[PDB]
Write an enzyme that holds these catalytic residues in place. Structure first.
Site, PDB file in Angstrom:
ATOM      1  N   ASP A  38     -12.135  -5.647   6.171  1.00 20.58           N
ATOM      2  CA  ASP A  38     -10.996  -4.756   5.950  1.00 20.58           C
ATOM      3  C   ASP A  38      -9.719  -5.404   6.464  1.00 20.58           C
ATOM      4  O   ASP A  38      -9.708  -5.936   7.565  1.00 20.58           O
ATOM      5  CB  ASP A  38     -11.232  -3.392   6.638  1.00 20.58           C
ATOM      6  N   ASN A  46       1.971  -1.439   3.615  1.00 18.50           N
ATOM      7  CA  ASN A  46       2.431  -0.959   2.311  1.00 18.50           C
ATOM      8  C   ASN A  46       3.493   0.148   2.455  1.00 18.50           C
ATOM      9  O   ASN A  46       4.478   0.187   1.710  1.00 18.50           O
ATOM     10  CB  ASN A  46       1.236  -0.457   1.506  1.00 18.50           C
ATOM     11  N   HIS A  51       5.038  -1.696  -2.079  1.00 21.85           N
ATOM     12  CA  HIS A  51       3.830  -2.157  -2.783  1.00 21.85           C
ATOM     13  C   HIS A  51       3.803  -3.655  -3.043  1.00 21.85           C
ATOM     14  O   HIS A  51       2.743  -4.269  -2.996  1.00 21.85           O
ATOM     15  CB  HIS A  51       3.667  -1.426  -4.115  1.00 21.85           C
ATOM     16  N   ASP A  55       0.949  -6.373  -1.916  1.00 22.85           N
ATOM     17  CA  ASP A  55       0.415  -7.401  -2.813  1.00 22.85           C
ATOM     18  C   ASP A  55       0.471  -8.797  -2.210  1.00 22.85           C
ATOM     19  O   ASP A  55      -0.494  -9.554  -2.292  1.00 22.85           O
ATOM     20  CB  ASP A  55       1.183  -7.389  -4.140  1.00 22.85           C
ATOM     21  N   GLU A  81      -8.181  -2.275   0.216  1.00 22.75           N
ATOM     22  CA  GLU A  81      -7.811  -3.491   0.928  1.00 22.75           C
ATOM     23  C   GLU A  81      -9.055  -4.130   1.537  1.00 22.75           C
ATOM     24  O   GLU A  81      -8.952  -4.886   2.491  1.00 22.75           O
ATOM     25  CB  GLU A  81      -6.756  -3.207   2.019  1.00 22.75           C
TER      26      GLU A  81
HETATM   27 MG   LIG Z   1      -8.660  -0.480   5.541  1.00 22.98          MG
END
Ligand SMILES: [Mg+2]
Length: 165
Positions: A38, A46, A51, A55, A81
């Site tokens: 993760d 974010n 956004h 990315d 993610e």
């Molecule tokens: Mg996460």
């Protein structure tokens, strides 16, 4: 259709077919390494940065990670993610080495055009044996990942290690 257009990594559905085949080919006394990864604080990134910045962080991870993998190792998007790593024929020592290398390298990363505070990874690790089912092994890895997250993130936990209580 096999790869994620954003990161250039395999997507989840393709990974599952690759990993499924690798698991079926697994000989009696052998094992594969499997991990769920993760990107810590992604949503916070974010939220503050936007956004496109998110990315760039996904792409930064992919770049960092590619450089840690061996010939024949497989890394894919898992959803959101999160990422999934298969290390064919690896044992616990090798899997942990790889995941620690990924963790430390992502922490040192510098995504272009962003000014994130800290980048870090949480990882749940497990080993895959013949007669295991892939979805149950992913579940095991996700349990270790949960422990990594609950334990403060920026860490790798494994199913072969003693848990808290
Ligand atoms: Mg996460």
């Amino acid at each position: 259709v096999a790869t994620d257009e954003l990161t250039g990594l395999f997507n989840r559905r393709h990974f599952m077919r690759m990993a499924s085949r690798a698991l079926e080919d697994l000989l009696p006394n052998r094992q594969h390494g499997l991990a769920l990864i993760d990107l810590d604080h992604f949503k916070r990134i974010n939220d503050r940065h936007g956004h496109a910045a998110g990315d760039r962080v996904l792409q930064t991870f992919a770049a960092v990670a590619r450089s840690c993998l061996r010939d024949g190792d497989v890394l894919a998007r898992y959803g959101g993610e999160e990422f999934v790593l298969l290390l064919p024929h690896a044992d616990a020592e090798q899997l942990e080495s790889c995941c620690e290398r990924l963790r430390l390298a992502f922490q040192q990363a510098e995504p272009v055009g962003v000014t994130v505070d800290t980048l870090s990874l949480s990882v749940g690790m497990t080993l895959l044996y013949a007669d295991d089912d892939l979805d149950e092994a992913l579940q095991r890895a996700d349990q270790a990942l949960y422990r990594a997250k609950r334990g403060g993130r920026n860490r790798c936990d494994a199913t072969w290690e003693v848990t808290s209580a």
